Every structure is written in C-alpha cells, then in structure tokens.
Amino acid sequence: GSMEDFVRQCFNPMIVELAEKAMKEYGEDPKIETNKFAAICTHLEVCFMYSDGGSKHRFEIIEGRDRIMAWTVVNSICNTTGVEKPKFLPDLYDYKENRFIEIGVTRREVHIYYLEKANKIKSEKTHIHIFSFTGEEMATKADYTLDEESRARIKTRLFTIRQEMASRSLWDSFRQSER
Ligand SMILES: O=c1cc(-c2ccc(O)c(O)c2)oc2cc(O)cc(O)c12
Ligand SMILES: [Mg+2]
Ligand SMILES: [Mn+2]
Numbered sequence: 001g002s003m004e005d006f007v008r009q010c011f012n013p014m015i016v017e018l019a020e021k022a023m024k025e026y027g028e029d030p031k032i033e034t035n036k037f038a039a040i041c042t043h044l045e046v047c048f049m050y051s052d053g054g055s056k057h058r059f060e061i062i063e064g065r066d067r068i069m070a071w072t073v074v075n076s077i078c079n080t081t082g083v084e085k086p087k088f089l090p091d092l093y094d095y096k097e098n099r100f101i102e103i104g105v106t107r108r109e110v111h112i113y114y115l116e117k118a119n120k121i122k123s124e125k126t127h128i129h130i131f132s133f134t135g136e137e138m139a140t141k142a143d144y145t146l147d148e149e150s151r152a153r154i155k156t157r158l159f160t161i162r163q164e165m166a167s168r169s170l171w172d173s174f175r176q177s178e179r
Contacts, residue, residue: 003034003170010164011041018044018064035177042161043105046131046154047091050103053150060093063103074100086123094127094145101145104130105158107178110138131155133162 007030008016019040020030030037044064051059060077062070070089077093078085083100090100102121106113110130117128129139135155137144144151165171 001034002168003038003165003174004031006165006168006170007034007038007041010161011045015041015044015048035174038165038174039105039178042158043103045157046105047103049154049157050101050129050146050150051092053146053153054096058094058096059101060095061091062089062093062100063091084123084125086121086126088121090126097127097145100126102126102128104128106130106132107175108132110136114138131158133158135159 007019011019019037022040023030023033023037028036047061047063051061060073062073065073067089073093074085074089077083077100081098083098086100091103092101093099094101100123102117104110104113104117110132114128114130117130121128127140127143127145129137129145131137131154135158137151137155139145162171165174
C-alpha cells in the first residue's frame, strides 16, 4: 500500500514499468504483492548499476529484455564466443572476462542465496554475484568483477533503500516476505 507508493517514488519509471509487466506475466499484481514489486525493482536497478560499473559497453544487459531479445543476445554470444548456452536466462554478459553473470539481491544472508543460485544454475561457467541490503557481497571464486568503488555505489544504494523503507515502517514486512 504505502510500499506501492514507496516504489513509485524511489525507482525510475522505466524500472517500475518493467517490474509491473514482469509480475503481470506471472499472474501477480504489483498493487497486491507490493514487497515482490519492490524486490524486483531493486534487482533490476542493481543489474543496471552493475552494467555501468566498468568500461563503456563492457557488459551486455540480459535482465529486463523481452524473452526473444534476451535469448537473441545469449545465443549470439554463445555463437560468437563458443561459451556454453545456459538453461535459464542470466542477468548480464561480461565481455572482459567472457562469462555470463547472475546477480542476486537478498534480504537474508548472502551465503544462503549464493548456494541456492549455484545449485539452480547447473552451468559450470556462469559467475554469481550476490548483494545484501546491509552491505555484504559474495561472488564466485571471490572474484567481484568490478572495482571497489563501483561495488560501494551498489552497496550504499541498497543501504539507502533499506533505510528509507525503515523510515516509513515498511522494512520489517519487506525483509520477512523474502521466501
Ligand atoms: O521479473 C522477475 C524477476 C525475478 C528474478 C528474481 C531473482 C533474480 O535473481 C532474477 O534474475 C530475476 O523474479 C520474479 C519473481 C516474480 O514472482 C515475478 C517477477 O516478475 C520476477
Ligand atoms: Mg535474471
Ligand atoms: Mn538475478
């Protein structure tokens, strides 16, 4: 309710519109599952920030793209690099390291979400990078891909979001709602 308002105020309209569409495609109503709505918005925002954290066009964004375009990007990349085709769409491709990236944002402990992602992925080559809202991070082989300053920007954004939700008394419900 107030969470819906929070989302519409806190996130850029491009992000919010994407999230609304994404949820509706799974039969979920943004105006009802408002915690899910915020979580989806945050994860997308983190994918965009992450993609801007290195050199100009170091990263292809895959999250947020319609399915056809996403798989176009992915098949194309596996075709031009010989890198293995994932079973599920990842979040980005790193041109410098030549590997796909799965981004996780979690309210819980990072190690728990890291393991869930890892054992869902199956693809031996896709890098995993997990962020929490309380400034923790965890990445495959402890390789964090970006420099400390770019990661600090994400971590601080996430902290500010959590503080803002707390300010409005939404943080408790948000945190507990993660399944
Ligand atoms: O767009 C959605 C995106 C995702 C999602 C969740 C975690 C990830 O690490 C990720 O890369 C994507 O999960 C959802 C879960 C939903 O219930 C509805 C949605 O629209 C989404
Ligand atoms: Mg994704
Ligand atoms: Mn992800």
